[PDB]
Amino acid sequence: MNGILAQDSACSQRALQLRTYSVVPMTSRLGLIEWLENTVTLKDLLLNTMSQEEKAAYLSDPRAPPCEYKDWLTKMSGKHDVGAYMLMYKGANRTETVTSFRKRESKVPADLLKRAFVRMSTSPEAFLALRSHFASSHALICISHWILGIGDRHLNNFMVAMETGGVIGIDFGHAFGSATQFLPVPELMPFRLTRQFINLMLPMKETGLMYSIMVHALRAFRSDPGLLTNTMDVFVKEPSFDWKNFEQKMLKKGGSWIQEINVAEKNWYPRQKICYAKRKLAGANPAVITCDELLLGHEKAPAFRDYVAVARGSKDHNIRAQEPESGLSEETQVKCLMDQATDPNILGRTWEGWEPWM
Ligand SMILES: Nc1ncnc2c1ncn2[C@@H]1O[C@H](COP(=O)(O)OP(=O)(O)OP(=O)(O)O)[C@@H](O)[C@H]1O
Ligand SMILES: [Mg+2]
């Protein structure tokens, strides 16, 4: 990807790149990841910014978002486990989620990331430059991850450097829609773009820099689907990337999976992955791809209709259903992506470990 983007002129004038750290399995059990200097998780940067009372309430308060959300799931479903999400997709409409979800979001400190930056920078150049750098990098990674369908983008999978504002993606345990496909609680966003990101740009919403870069990137890729498509097809056809390797990762997710039941092993459909990748690179609607992945993964679930109704949206508030299912341009695709990733109806139904409120 960095090869392509180095060769796209409109991106090269923006010096755009992902960072990679070299990775070396020496054995099927064992390997090294190269480490990175003066880096933290995004979660740690955030909670390092909360005052004692902000921090202390946020840990445990029955009205802090972590308690208030499980309580809302609990009353909107009557259960206290993974099935509470399932039942709430049947049980809560838009209004019932939006209301609690706005009340929830309100309790998150609005400035927090900005507050972090302004007190890790000398002077306003050391503010502006970092904000630009972060913003560029966050956008660039988001589009990239949608192309690869990477789904498990919670706060601990993003690292922020100190020596520059360039964000770094890690923990790629879910290639090609695997999280939206096989988890009991499906995660429906194309990438993370929650409140704090927008708030960092508060006067000057995403339709500036992020939107611009996202658009340049997607065009630069779509200039040459061939090489990237061939590489992804070689990826998805590896004999070590079957379902047996995958489900023996899915165990290792802290009870968020279907715990010790229903592997349903004729579950693996490798050509559909590269087919959906080619559809994305051809100009397909992101909501249609999400609905297709939902149909492939959860077809017999009692909330499949509600799943696709939430993922597709309504023609009244979200512009991803007011567009065709294919032939979209790069700008329309990025608009649909930003509408789906910031949809409150989708964020109000997300798994609690993803932390959609922050
Ligand atoms: N390449 C890296 N360079 C520097 N620090 C890293 C790197 N990879 C991981 N870390 C740090 O080590 C921690 C744990 O690493 P790892 O990715 O194995 O955790 P994990 O199983 O994904 O846990 P979690 O999802 O809870 O963050 C990360 O949260 C991060 O702080
Ligand atoms: Mg992780």
For CA atoms 237, 240, 245, 249, the dihedral sign is negative
Nearest in space to 298 (alpha carbons), one of 308, 289, 288, 283: 308
The answer to whether residues 169 and 157 touch, using CB atoms and an 8 Å cutoff, is yes
32 lines ligand 1 (CB under 6 A): no
Nearest in space to 168 (alpha carbons), one of 50, 35, 280, 15: 35
The distance from CA 28 to its chain's CA centroid, rounded to whole angstroms, is 28
37 secondary structure, DSSP code: S
d(CA 321, CA 315) in angstroms, rounded, equals: 5
Q: Cα–Cα distances in Å, from 66 out to 244, 255, 260? A: 34, 17, 26
What separation in Å is there between the alpha carbon of 179 and the centre of ligand 2?
13
d(CA 182, CA 176) in angstroms, rounded, equals: 11
What separation in Å is there between the alpha carbon of 44 and the centre of ligand 2?
13
Q: Are strands 39-41 and 31-33 parallel, antiparallel or unpaired?
A: unpaired
Bridge partners (DSSP) of residue 161 are 39
223 lines ligand 1 (CB under 6 A): no
223 secondary structure, DSSP code: T
39 lines ligand 1 (CB under 6 A): yes
21 lines ligand 1 (CB under 6 A): yes
d(CA 91, CA 200) in angstroms, rounded, equals: 34
Q: Which residues of 280-303 are buried (b: 16+ CB within 10 A; e: fewer)?
A: bbebbbbbbbbbbbbebbbeeeeb
Q: Are strands 167-169 and 31-33 parallel, antiparallel or unpaired?
A: unpaired
- Long-range pairs for 168-175: beta carbons < 8 A, 24 or more residues apart: 168/19, 168/21, 168/36, 168/39, 169/18, 169/141, 169/144, 169/145, 173/249, 174/150, 175/148, 175/149, 175/150, 175/235, 175/241
Q: Integer distance in angstroms from the first to the last C-alpha of the chain?
A: 29
Bridge partners (DSSP) of residue 33 are 23
At residue 242, the 3 state secondary structure works out as coil
Mutate to test the pocket of ligand 1, among 18, 150, 171 (most ligand atoms within 8 A of CB): 171
155 secondary structure, DSSP code: G
d(CA 227, CA 121) in angstroms, rounded, equals: 41
* 8-17-40 Cα angle (round to 5): 165
CB atoms within 10 A of CB 197: 19
What separation in Å is there between the alpha carbon of 156 and the centre of ligand 2?
5
207 secondary structure, DSSP code: T
d(CA 176, CA 150) in angstroms, rounded, equals: 6
Q: Which residue has the tokens 């070396």?
A: 24
252 burial (CB, 10 Å; 0-12 / 13-18 / 19+) is exposed
d(CA 74, CA 62) in angstroms, rounded, equals: 13
d(CA 45, CA 351) in angstroms, rounded, equals: 22
The distance from CA 20 to its chain's CA centroid, rounded to whole angstroms, is 19
d(CA 350, CA 307) in angstroms, rounded, equals: 12
At residue 161, the 3 state secondary structure works out as strand
Q: How many residues does the chain have?
A: 358
At residue 89, the 3 state secondary structure works out as helix
What separation in Å is there between the alpha carbon of 308 and the centre of ligand 2?
27
d(CA 292, CA 276) in angstroms, rounded, equals: 9
Q: Phi first, then psi: what are they for 113, rounded to 5°?
A: -60, -45
What number does the ligand 1 atom closest to the CA of 173 have?
Answer: 22
The distance from CA 172 to its chain's CA centroid, rounded to whole angstroms, is 12
The answer to whether residues 331 and 143 touch, using CB atoms and an 8 Å cutoff, is no
The answer to whether residues 198 and 205 touch, using CB atoms and an 8 Å cutoff, is yes
What separation in Å is there between the alpha carbon of 45 and the centre of ligand 1?
14
The answer to whether residues 270 and 237 touch, using CB atoms and an 8 Å cutoff, is yes
The resolution in angstroms reads 8.9
